[PDB]
C-alpha cells in the first residue's frame, strides 16, 4: 500500500491514541453482531447469544486485542504485507476456510469503530488513508487463496 507522507503521519498519529484494550474487541464483537454467521468460527468462545453478551465476552475482547495487534504489525510493515501476514493467511485460508469477503467486512468494521471512538477527528481524508490500510491487510490475509 502507498500512503503519502501526509497520510502516513495522520494514520500514525491517530493509531497512537487507539485504546488497545478495547478497540480490537469492539471491532471483532461488531463483526459477530452485524454478520452473525461469523460466529460459527468462534464456537469455543462461549456466550455469543445476544449483542451484549458478544461485546462483553472476555474471549472476544482478548481475541480482538490479537486482531488489533495484527493491524499494528501491518501498519509497521506497509511495504511487505504479504510477508508480514503469510503465517496468518495460511491459518485463515487453508485451515479455517474464511471466505475472503469476511476479511473485508472486518476491516471496514474496524473503520467504523475508529470513527466511533474518534468522532470528528476521523476525517474523510483520514478514513481514505485507513481504507488503503485495511484493503492492504485484507488482501494480504487472502494471499494464500490467490
Amino acid at each position: 500500500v502507498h500512503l503519502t507522507p501526509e497520510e502516513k503521519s495522520a494514520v500514525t498519529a491517530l493509531w497512537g491514541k487507539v485504546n488497545v484494550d478495547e478497540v480490537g474487541g469492539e471491532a471483532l464483537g461488531r463483526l459477530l453482531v452485524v454478520y452473525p454467521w461469523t460466529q460459527r468460527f468462534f464456537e469455543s468462545f462461549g456466550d455469543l447469544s445476544t449483542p451484549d453478551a458478544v461485546m462483553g465476552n472476555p474471549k472476544v475482547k482478548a481475541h480482538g486485542k490479537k486482531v488489533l495487534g495484527a493491524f499494528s504489525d501491518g501498519l509497521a510493515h506497509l511495504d511487505n504485507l504479504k510477508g508480514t501476514f503469510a503465517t496468518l493467511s495460511e491459518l485463515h485460508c487453508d485451515k479455517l476456510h474464511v471466505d475472503p469477503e469476511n476479511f473485508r467486512l472486518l476491516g471496514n468494521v474496524l473503520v467504523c469503530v475508529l470513527a466511533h471512538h474518534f468522532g470528528k477527528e476521523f476525517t474523510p481524508p483520514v478514513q481514505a488513508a485507513y481504507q488503503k490500510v485495511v484493503a492492504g491487510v485484507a488482501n494480504a490475509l487472502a494471499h494464500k487463496y490467490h
Binding site: 453482531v33 452485524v34 449483542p51 466511533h116 474523510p124 481514505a128
Partner: protein, 141 residues
C-alpha cells in the same frame, strides 16, 4: 428482511440526523469519493472538489431520500420506484458501489452519533441500507 426491532432502531437513529441531513449526506459522499475513487466515474458532470456546492446539494437529496425510505420501510419498492428507475434502469450502477456508500454512511453516523451507534443499531442500519440498495439496483417494473 427488517425485523420490528430493526425498524425501530433505524427510526430512532436516523431520526437524530434532523437538520444535519445535508451535512451528513454530503460527508458520506465525500468519504465515498475520497476513499473509493472509482465511484467518481458515475459523476463525471459533477464538480467533485471538496466543499463543492454541487456535492453538498446532492448530499441533501441523498439524506432526504433515506428519510423517505425510513418513513416507508414497509413499502420501499413502491416508495422508491423513481430512484430505482434512475439507479437501475438509467445509470446501471454496479451494486458494489452501493456497499461502499452504505459503509460511508455508517462511518458518518458513527462519527457524529456515537450514542446512537450501538452494536444492535449498527446491525439494523446495515440491513436497512442493504435493503435500500437492493431496491435501487433491481429492475422490478
Amino acid at each position: 428482511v427488517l425485523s420490528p426491532a430493526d425498524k425501530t432502531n433505524v427510526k430512532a437513529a436516523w431520526g437524530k440526523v434532523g437538520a444535519h441531513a445535508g451535512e451528513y449526506g454530503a460527508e458520506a459522499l465525500e468519504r465515498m469519493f475520497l476513499s473509493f475513487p472509482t465511484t467518481k466515474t458515475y459523476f463525471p458532470h459533477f464538480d467533485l472538489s471538496h466543499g463543492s456546492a454541487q456535492v453538498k446539494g446532492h448530499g441533501k437529496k441523498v439524506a432526504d431520500a433515506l428519510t423517505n425510505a425510513v418513513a416507508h420501510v414497509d413499502d420501499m419498492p413502491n416508495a422508491l420506484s423513481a430512484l430505482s428507475d434512475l439507479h437501475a434502469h438509467k445509470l446501471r450502477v454496479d451494486p458494489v458501489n452501493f456497499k461502499l456508500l452504505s459503509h460511508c454512511l455508517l462511518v458518518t453516523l458513527a462519527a457524529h452519533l456515537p450514542a446512537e451507534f450501538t452494536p444492535a443499531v449498527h446491525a439494523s442500519l446495515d440491513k436497512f441500507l442493504a435493503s435500500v440498495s437492493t431496491v435501487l439496483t433491481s429492475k422490478y417494473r
